[PDB]
RNA sequence: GAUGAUUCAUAAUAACUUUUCGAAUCGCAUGGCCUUGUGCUGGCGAUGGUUCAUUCAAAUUUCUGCCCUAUCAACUUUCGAUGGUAGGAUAGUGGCCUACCAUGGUUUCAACGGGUAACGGAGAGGGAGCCUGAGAAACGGCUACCACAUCCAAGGAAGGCAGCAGGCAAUUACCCAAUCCUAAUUCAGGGAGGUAGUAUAAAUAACGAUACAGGGCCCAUUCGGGUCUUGUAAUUGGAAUGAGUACAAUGUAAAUACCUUAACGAGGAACAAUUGGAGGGCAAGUCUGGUGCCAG
RNA sequence: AUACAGUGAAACUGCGAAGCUCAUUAAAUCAGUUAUCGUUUAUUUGAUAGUUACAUGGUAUAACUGUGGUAA
């Protein structure tokens, strides 16, 4: 009978009383045997806590199987053999048998997102990845407990080196694993994290060193019980508000009820919240409210109907609160499509009058003309153009997640709000429904993953003015220092991820791992001129891809697992099959981030320019001790650059970014026909060659791409505007201007070639329409060929046209659009478009006569 | 059974009684005195190669 | 040649066959010869193999074998009923089945039908099909269905318990020894099998001595009469032994038990059986009724 | 024991696996008997086959070694 140190129970009771979470870091091979004893302490503290337990593991369970029959057979064989007594079970076996444990692979964390668990266990520390820490921690219940089992022997040395000195980091014999070495030191900062051994003795590395038992026993509940009591008589509000779990969540329903009561069809209500705050519960309750109110045609849209299972489930609960009864008052229709996995698509309601809730794909906005209410769940995942089409003359409910799932950058939500500034009503849910507000672990998880980091406007720049681009200087960021928690580093780290998240469309939690452990990635920051923590203005992430990475890949195959991939060499290889490009050493700019407020001031363009100079050599050990910290930033001259053959960028093709890269002397090489589902935008790879190195192969790629883009413009790129397509054509043509060599040149059309493509009968048609003796529809056959030669440059110098006319001729020929369609895009009358075109082919008819 | 010991855990008053080179590290870890946050205070980083060590952010 | 009887046994000829079989196997011993080569020639067994007979069985099969019955007189051809010929199936005979052909077969000598103290033959969740073996349409296995029902990460997997034994509650523990049964077998096994577990005759006493007392009893509605060694609610002495306390052997596969048998074991022999009935009597006691001191 | 040679897990071969509960049936159950020249028959018993070889192949794999999937 060994007494536990009083800290372990007191933390558990304090968390239960305050409804706060707690972490326990168990180190030892017998770590599993303590888990039953810890769980007994939770249920003893309060019997109302959820008894379901979440077990997470990578591949194998620690010494047991989750199959009931396999164990009892093993137990029965052991009893029969005489190794074990007939009735003797150890506590660990009894723990697993009686309680409800959910065994989940690390890969399949999407499944556990919805369910609530009282306790979470993470089996393996080495395989911990940021999404798996955000996802699993959120699935515990308030007063619940998270346990990480640091059983791996190598980790124990990593623990030892940290405790003896914070400076030196243990390093085994290319993955450096700073995040996991970064994962440990934050646990010490947390007040509610306690690190323990297999004998239940407290290791002093924990932050929970001075935990004392709180006296026996919240304001938010008081503000909630009074609200529910006041509204009991007011149906349907009373029954529906009763389903509310928090003060803010109830207010969101009331505001939704107000919008439902106002009956204004030009009203948009925006709900913004973090994950787990109860948005889908709020929406489902309100849909029940509108359905009780009298709305007939209720519409629901989301990227997939599967995500709506929570939203529909709470509709039926709100239905239950309102007296709605299945198979009498309403009917449920499930999908017949195997892809949707029997997801609920439509609910038909029959009392009073026939009312319908139905799911519609975001693309199919045409059916919404009869819509009285559309609820857009997870609007962050839908492309911006599509949601714009979904904003019709009807009541709109919009829910967007901030730092939940993939979601979107915060600024993107702000840009959407700026567009709405149609009457706009904004609602925010800040109170979580799962636990007590201000829980240390959520703040701990946010600081570790930097999910809650926010960009801040700095007065200092305003007082001194925006730095002129030439004054700023790019500096290399040492990654070892950045991920070390020295308090200056974190504020420096946060400012980077603040710029990281805001700029680009979509950013996953696992990204914070990627730049940390992977060696090929390097961080560059366009710091302001030196004259306090330096505040970034532009940050660039590079990935070294090419022959340099082969040595790491060969090491990666040696261990038996291949890490990552060289996307550009594979992308260029599959399309064109050039062996040499794979051999060429190159760099990919994974992401370039600039402050949205300071956009268009040229900070991003200069950083690329200075980046280009550094790898060109125009400016010509910081590793930590391996079982005093080196500088946080390193100047360009201080570190030699690696020999590179090209600079590559991969991005969704949009007009703004394409011009940005176009102005930076990059040349496009490939464009994906299949638009990305999340953005509806086509990925483009666009390449730049450095001076002093061969450039012929870029030119050859660019020429093939133009013939690529011209022909494929009809298949799937018809959606692109004619002006956008021209810019892609012209940017590739800049590549020809890069090459002063005349070895490769276009060929003029011959008379023999002309006779084959067009018969003399056609040339009579070409002449007559110029004389106006024909209708336009007759010459329709000619147009696609005419576009191919002109943009293929077969006619040559003789025939030239304006940018507007190139857009017109490009489009009918290759976008394939009708003339009246061109009138709208170019903001020209249809008659003028026809008149301008008639002049275009008059030049061409004159040209063919000249050659003849 | 609250009062009785179930499994290996016995609870009385506010105290709980339970029956129960790597070893060298654990004992060394147990004997650590300073908290991490206290060790955290002492450490300075260099923001630049020749810059002064900045300890706490203002 | 054989039987009562054969196209039976057997032999021969001409062909046929998804033409069979006619030791490329194992243990122990190393003898007799010589032509010294490990040359020739070899002893006892095991496991295999064709056919016949024998044996263990099996399947059809002849004739006989105690109920009342007509208030059960026709039954059978009713998807063969009686028989013939040819074929299919079959270890085989055979309407067992199939094609043609004849209208037959039992019955008042009781056909057919009914009742019965005719306990005086079937399945393994329910129907269908199939597989092995000398022997099964297998309490084995497989497939499709019809339902039951278990688990799961809900992607699938698996079951015959839809059992058994009980109540309106301990079926368990020890063995193949005894008689038998199956096997690469003396030796191994058998919940076959065996062993154990949970109304009848005795005892509670038998025998002496002393002391002290005059009363004991029978019969009689009546009055009374008849008769003699009686009472102890007294003291006292030495013997016998059973239940129990149990050392052993025997017993038995072992063990329990039985039989036998050392030591101890009784005066309140307290080592303390019950059941029912009939009468009393007692207070400074209690209640009730009356004609003292009574009556209930 | 210089093929091995005692014992011997596993695996391949060989042999054998053939009490209960419901219903009920008049010589169709069963008992006695006859025949099988109309028949199958493991096993027991006795008989019975003169019609590269100083020893052929994997046209062969288990057990076994090692690599993995799966909640199982």
Swiss-Prot record, chain A:
Coiled coil: none annotated. GO terms for cellular component: 90S preribosome; nucleolus; preribosome, small subunit precursor; small-subunit processome. Acetyl-CoA binds at residues 592-594, 599-605, 663. It catalyses: a cytidine in 18S rRNA + acetyl-CoA + ATP + H2O = an N(4)-acetylcytidine in 18S rRNA + ADP + phosphate + CoA + H(+); a cytidine in tRNA + acetyl-CoA + ATP + H2O = an N(4)-acetylcytidine in tRNA + ADP + phosphate + CoA + H(+). Residues 525-630 form the N-acetyltransferase domain. Its EC number is 2.3.1.-. It is found in: Nucleus, Nucleolus. It comes from the Eukaryota. GO terms for biological process: maturation of SSU-rRNA; mRNA modification; ribosomal small subunit biogenesis; rRNA acetylation involved in maturation of SSU-rRNA; tRNA acetylation; tRNA wobble cytosine modification. Disruption phenotype: Leads to a strong inhibition of 18S rRNA synthesis. Deletion results in an altered alkali-soluble beta-glucan phenotype. Heterozygous mutants show haploinsufficiency in K1 killer toxin resistance. InterPro entries: GNAT_dom, NAT10, NAT10/TcmA_helicase, P-loop_NTPase, TmcA/NAT10/Kre33, TmcA_N, tRNA_bind_dom. The keyword Nucleotide-binding applies. ATP binds at residues 276-285, 434. It is an enzyme of class 2 (transferase). Changing residue 279 to A: Reduces 18S rRNA acetylation by 80% and tRNA acetylation by 47%. GO terms for molecular function: 18S rRNA cytidine N-acetyltransferase activity; ATP binding; snoRNA binding; tRNA binding; tRNA N4-acetyltransferase activity. Keywords: Acyltransferase, ATP-binding, Nucleotide-binding, Nucleus, Phosphoprotein, rRNA processing, Transferase, tRNA processing. Belongs to the RNA cytidine acetyltransferase family. NAT10 subfamily. Interacts with TAN1. Associates with 90S pre-ribosomal particles. RNA cytidine acetyltransferase with specificity toward both 18S rRNA and tRNAs. Catalyzes the formation of N(4)-acetylcytidine (ac4C) at positions 1280 and 1773 in 18S rRNA. Required for early nucleolar cleavages of precursor rRNA at sites A0, A1 and A2 during 18S rRNA synthesis. Catalyzes the formation of ac4C at position 12 in serine and leucine tRNAs. Requires the tRNA-binding adapter protein TAN1 for full tRNA acetyltransferase activity but not for 18S rRNA acetylation. This is RNA cytidine acetyltransferase.
Swiss-Prot record, chain B:
It is found in: Cytoplasm; Nucleus, Nucleolus. Signal peptide: none annotated. It comes from the Eukaryota. Interacts directly with RCL1 and the U3 snoRNA to form a stable subcomplex. Component of the 90S small subunit processome also known as 90S pre-ribosome that consists of the 35S pre-rRNA, early-associating ribosomal proteins most of which are part of the small ribosomal subunit, the U3 snoRNA and associated proteins. Belongs to the TRAFAC class translation factor GTPase superfamily. Bms1-like GTPase family. BMS1 subfamily. GTPase required for synthesis of 40S ribosomal subunits and for processing the 35S pre-rRNA at sites A0, A1, and A2. Controls access of pre-ribosomal RNA intermediates to RCL1 during ribosome biogenesis by binding of RCL1 in a GTP-dependent manner and, via its affinity to U3 snoRNA, delivering it to pre-ribosomes. GTP-binding and/or GTP hydrolysis may induce conformational rearrangements within the BMS1-RCL1 complex allowing the interaction of RCL1 with its RNA substrate. Required for RCL1 import into the nucleus. This is Ribosome biogenesis protein BMS1. The lineage of its organism: Eukaryota, Fungi, Dikarya, Ascomycota, Saccharomycotina. The gene is BMS1. The chain holds residues 356 to 429 of 1183 of the full protein.
